[PDB]
Symmetry: D2
Subunit: 476 residues, 4 copies
């Protein structure tokens, strides 16, 4: 009769099963409810609130071209807000799509019991995953604990889900500003993020075509290089649900059969490794559902509570050029390559030895794709929580990690133009360069480029004493 | 019979009248002589010696494909060096091309009398100019003193010179390394200039085609913008004589008649303004020939002899973002847009009030197109020596000169990535921004960006007291 | 356990429901059986047998890259041939896809009862249609009789079918040449069809991308012009089942939502008219299933049994330049634009008044997309059998049908280069041109271009006497 | 003071020495005089008069954009016409450019003596040649008699001429229609030549750029193939003087030094063979100047005066497909490839044995580049007049000349679409094909393709009897 489609993090119209199912019977009107106080400490950060504002306006005009209007409501309790929207419009059903983070699971469990008190039929759908996490089990019917044990089952699952076409027409018979999504001082500096990004589902479709046709071919040899645009740059579109992940899986498995029929064995190997990256997004929702504070294996660790070392880390003034170039790209554009996120966060935890909660809260505020389940899997991968993760006893050599991800030094020279005439054999560790090499370029360490804020042999021996105390503070 | 073609600053084979005339009679062999001690204080700088080294090797292989070999000689006196090359090879003639800087004029005057002592016929040719400076006169037969009085005569001169084809074959019947053109410490930092530049006459021809076909059309509206490659980037090719200037004048006047026949009035107006820039190169040789220390109208000026202000100027750490971005581009690439060269040199002379000799010697060492006659006309244009030049009583507003040459702030954000989230209305003067605007971006002045090293009202009143003393020290 | 996939007219691997269902359980091996004697008079023609030969070899190597081999069998009775293939390989199931022409419907009905005598499970699938013809009914549950009554129901059908991905791997545990598909005299003239066409499912995918990205935009204004490639040229791929028709419907309805979101109202109108052409392919299978000699409303028509008029028609020597250019393109390439097929077949039936069986048998032998159900709907559309078809009392003016489909005369000048200097106002009717116009070009009618073989006023009055006799021979 | 620039066959403004010299002193006005009755039998043909009409209108508007107007005069005596134009405008000088055909040499000799009777200074210039024909001599100072003896001297001539820039402005202080250049019946068939050609000097410049950048590279391997556009298509621009031939020589010798510096030895060899074709245009003016009826070595030849064989030759209905395709391209477009002009004219002279005057008059009427001196050299090359020409005792095999210039048969299939399904081993000689091959395509010889009008063994023995009679009729 009358159905509310409640948009939360599915801001698209293609392959939207809650919008497609409501457009079969009767009258539809779409609703977004901004209720950030139920998230608690996972209130959306500053750069994420800019992206929601831009793509809700993109979604509102596209629903108007199908013939409707998007209704906005601001409350401190969203379960009292859709119920007040039902009493106004006289609606009988509420349809929405699932979410899997642990805050929204107990929130969606309560809104179902809140609305059979008023006799409203509530239907929820799957719009985010390939399979649901209660479908992938082991031989005994128990959940997995490693990724490649989990991903070899999803590729042999005896089924696969489909892509729904969008509806042909919507019908209403007809709101708050909610534009509180930004402060007025931070407003012109937020608008400079549009030099690199453009939100909306119509732009997510153009970036999937641009990746499939240009650099998906070279992905198996280039996905670790930070020079050049070698990855898809799809992660803020995939976080807000502007591109369907089953739409990506279908199109990549169709390019793979054409390249196997040309015997292009490298382009075919690239299509296999790109789908493994999509399976890491599937796995982050999997262990969040099954094993829902966070990093408890580091709770007797002696952390250095130094706030000016934290200020030098986010300013990009540490004296380590891969860390400084990554922190300047993060502030300028709101995105980092995956291998640079490992570099700047291993530096914060192992070298400066600041608390990991401090760095997680800075990533939550400055990344455009700040995802609750993917930030958990990333910070557990660098701290050694995951079984098949990184080791904690190890510190990375700056010259070796420089040669892997930035072999010609062109990532450092783009973001630190003061080091543009420094040769590549010393550009990732300028404190080791001899004195006449440094002044053959225009570099004096301490005046126009910084000295290293901690020496590498200082923190390597400061960690082994700090590792060996939390081993005996845990046994007591 | 046997003819030496002495290459000095004409490193090409197309439109080379000394090479073309020698290839008519008999045996030819080419000679370069590196003799930098006759230049005195105009010894070629560090970046210029890198370009000569790369393009002599480019010229040597192209003369081999015509069938010869380039002979190199190093001496502290070049007039004793070609005479020793004549006695070895048994040559009868020496042909070369003219130069017009005041050191080479008295040096070429002496080598003619040095070689009729041995009975050697010496012929010199015009390879650098459209007309010779003893051909453009006024109505009474006297030289001009302004540029547009001079350039309206050259466009109505009753003649024009032609483009010689290269010879079809050369004939010898057959050297020092001279590779002393770089220090071994400065060698790997010099090689990083190849990220932006490629010397040689074959590359000068590809950059003339690339400019004529892409952005010569938009030159009349874009030649003052430093964002984007809006100019030709031909000046280090035109300084070393790898592209002929009569070849440029012919090809641009042929595009102008095609655009006038399509009634493309803006593309035709752009071709008129680009040839006016070539006439400024002609005019710099004109007043050097007629009026050959240099800036004597500022000789009782009180200069501040502060050497750490000079170190902060060439490091790009002054706190003025147009000056800092221009000084970082100059060190990284060896080239600046013409409007930025006015900005960074007016700042050194009017704000810091350092001696102009100090800044001229730094431009001589860091520019790839460091030309003796063009650096004279440029530094006389900013100091008020020229009649139709800049005023000396004026200081430029940083916001207004920012909006003219960098209207969207994309030149500052490329070279100073720390200011990438600062809005455009304050990016050229961050000390005027309110305090919540600066911390809405990641900018604290004094820690990750510098404070202005002198305030603008300090130096404006320091100049008016310094101007008014050299007015009375000159009358005494 | 072991399953035969019987390929008949579904020569692809993407969206193949019989191949996809067999690849779930066990061992698969593919089989084609050439049995042309069960078709009777619908034995495949000469150009169709060339295309089957080229695309079976294309399908055989693509099944090898998935790990199998295609087995070929030649029999005069295909129901005795798959049963002999089961006894060899020890297979338990046979899966295939439906067909809807009236010969294959009674043949598939008998092979099901032939194989439960041996206890073999037989499954058939839908691979050719959007919906099955027993699903589209009227309000009373009866089949339609007009096209636009039928197509307005298919666009409102409460369901739609999906696109299956191809299998990841096939398994056999392992044949006749059947290459009898061409005679040895006709073999080198058949191979010249490759100048215009390339069979195989991998080429059907490249022609769908090429049409969606280039000229689908302009289809609503260009689909009646025979100058230029304005249509998709997909019909021999769609006849042999090398491209899926649900794959076309999905991709065209996705381009339609992007163009509606740019307010490109003409590109959106073109996507609506292209899907109406696909619905004509759906409708031809619909009335073949419900109303399964053929043109019985012309059975007392007095036909002229003149065999040299039939020889002049297929040679393209009639003196009517649209008919002659269409007959020369048909012999050279094996394809005609849809508006030219109306022209050359209305000419054979209304002007020459030859029997329509004679022209249908020539189209069956010379077209690459000679489809049984689509040739029926086409020849019923020109003869007036269909209710919403052409009128039979009318003859078309050659100048008016020339201006509609060939407005600048460039289709005639391509295929009849003798008329290249004839102006456009007379190029479609040269017998009406004045005598000095014809000899201002190089045209003398009767020597280098033919006179019209029948005059237009002769056959217009010969038809009205021939129409009015079959009206009274039918009432008796 | 006042100067007439008399345009005859130099319809351009770039590199025009008579227009450039007049634009130095005073007032200029341009004049074309149409006087076709002084040419006698070399009255310009039908297709040439269409091109003059189109490019005089192109030249008139381009002189208006320089500020003048083109004056037209029609007379039966041009020497009385410019003298009447002098008396009207009060002009003092007449400047024009040389021509070298033997009619214009004695006409220009008389107009000089006609105008010193009135005291008018007459100056003539070189605008058509690289060198003048009184500058290329042998060792004794005598003219050459072979081409490669002549062209090895022009490449070693101790000089070369230059390219003048166009004037910047013209000055008048200010006519008949002459549009009689076409009949009103032939007017709409002449306008269809614009499908392939576009006259004017601005289009001659775009076709020189298009050839230098696309297919000059492949010229040494493709200049004998008639499939594809492998030559420059510059000959009607070079005949009417819309492109300068010194402009072509300069630009091709500049591409040759760039390709020699990349060691592109095939692109460099192509630039050498293209300039040899330009030297054939130079040589045709050379022997016309020195050895000024025409083919007197065939004057006792027994010619067959059959006028219906002449009608079948120009209709393209001989039964020889290379001759028929060349005659249909010539009538449609007005141009033929150089190897096809040898084929269709050797066929007219050796097979049909029609008088060569009959075929020369048909080429004069149907070619757009019908040049008096180049048609002489071409018809002397096929008849054996030239020493290094063709032999007269030989007749060419149609299969061998077919494989040289049309190896895949795609030139025949374009112009004779009736033979599109005939395989390549018989497409150049269909009378030798076996009977089942011809009817496997749609070819019956005598009905839809013609039988050969003379058999090849008939005319081979008819020529040897006709050769051997003019040997004894000449000795008497
Ligand atoms: C410390 C740390 C924190 C991270 N925080 C986040 C976060 O907040 N949000 C987030 O989306 N990703 C996070 N990641 C994962 C990774 O950095 C990004 O997903 C990656 O940069 C996406 O960029 P892309 O689209 O170009 O990658 P692509 O190579 O194009 O990857 C394709 C898609 O797969 C997914 N994906 C790829 N790699 C991973 C991965 N390792 N884990 C999960 N999903 C993946 C993303 O949706 C991505 O768009 C984090 C990683 C680390 C080490
Ligand atoms: C006398 C006559 C005989 C015909 N015989 C045949 C035949 O044997 N086989 C055949 O496939 N078509 C036949 N047609 C239909 C039509 O001529 C062709 O389908 C059309 O030329 C396909 O070319 P295309 O792919 O470029 O067209 P498009 O415009 O690209 O059409 C898209 C697709 O829709 C289908 N289609 C389009 N128009 C029609 C139509 N009128 N009827 C049925 N399907 C259509 C085809 O599969 C075609 O590939 C006949 C028409 C006439 C008038």
């Amino acid at each position: 009769k009358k159905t509310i489609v409640w948009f939360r993090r599915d801001l698209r119209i293609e392959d939207n099963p809650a919008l497609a199912a409501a457009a079969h019977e009767g009258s539809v009107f779409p609703v977004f409810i901004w209720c950030p106080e139920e998230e608690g400490q996972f209130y959306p950060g500053r750069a994420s609130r800019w992206w929601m504002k831009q793509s809700l306006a993109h979604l509102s005009q596209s629903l108007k071209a199908l013939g409707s209007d998007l209704t906005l409501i601001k409350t401190h309790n969203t379960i009292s807000a859709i119920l007040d929207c039902i009493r106004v419009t006289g609606a009988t059903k509420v349809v929405f799509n699932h979410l899997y983070d642990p805050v929204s699971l107990v929130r969606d469990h309560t809104v179902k019991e809140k609305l059979v008190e008023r006799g409203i039929s509530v239907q929820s759908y799957n719009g985010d995953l390939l399979y649901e996490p209660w479908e992938i089990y082991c031989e005994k019917g128990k959940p997995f604990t490693s990724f490649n044990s989990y991903w070899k089952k999803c590729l042999d699952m005896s089924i696969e889900s489909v892509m729904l076409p969008p509806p042909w027409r919507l019908m209403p018979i007809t709101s708050i500003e909610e534009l509180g999504l930004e402060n007025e001082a931070e407003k012109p500096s937020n608008a400079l993020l549009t030099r690199a990004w453009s939100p909306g589902w119509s732009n997510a479709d153009k970036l999937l075509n641009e990746f499939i046709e240009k650099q998906l071919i070279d992905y198996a040899k280039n996905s670790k290089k930070v020079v050049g645009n070698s990855t898809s740059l799809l992660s803020p579109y995939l976080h807000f649900g502007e591109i369907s992940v089953r739409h990506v899986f279908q199109c990549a498995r169709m390019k793979q059969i054409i390249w196997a029929r040309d015997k292009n064995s490298e382009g075919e190997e690239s299509a296999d490794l790109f789908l493994r990256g999509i399976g890491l997004r599937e796995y982050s929702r999997y262990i969040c559902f099954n094993f829902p504070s966070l990093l408890s294996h580091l709770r007797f660790f002696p952390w250095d509570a130094d706030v000016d070392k934290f200020k030098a880390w986010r300013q990009g003034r540490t004296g380590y050029p891969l860390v400084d170039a990554g922190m300047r790209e993060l502030w300028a554009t709101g995105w980092m390559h995956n291998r640079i996120r490992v570099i700047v966060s291993s530096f914060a935890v192992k070298f400066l030895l600041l608390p990991a909660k401090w760095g997680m809260k800075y990533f939550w505020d400055t990344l455009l794709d700040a995802d609750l389940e993917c930030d958990i899997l990333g910070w557990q991968y660098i701290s050694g929580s995951i079984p098949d993760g990184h080791e904690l006893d190890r510190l990375d050599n700056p010259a070796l990690q420089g040669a892997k991800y930035d072999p010609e030094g062109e990532y450092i020279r783009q973001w630190l133009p003061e080091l543009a005439r420094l040769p590549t054999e010393w550009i990732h560790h300028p404190w080791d360069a001899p004195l006449t090499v440094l002044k053959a370029s225009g570099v004096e360490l301490g005046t126009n480029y910084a000295k290293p804020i901690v020496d590498i042999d200082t923190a390597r021996e400061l960690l082994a004493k700090a590792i060996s105390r939390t081993r005996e503070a845990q046994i007591m």
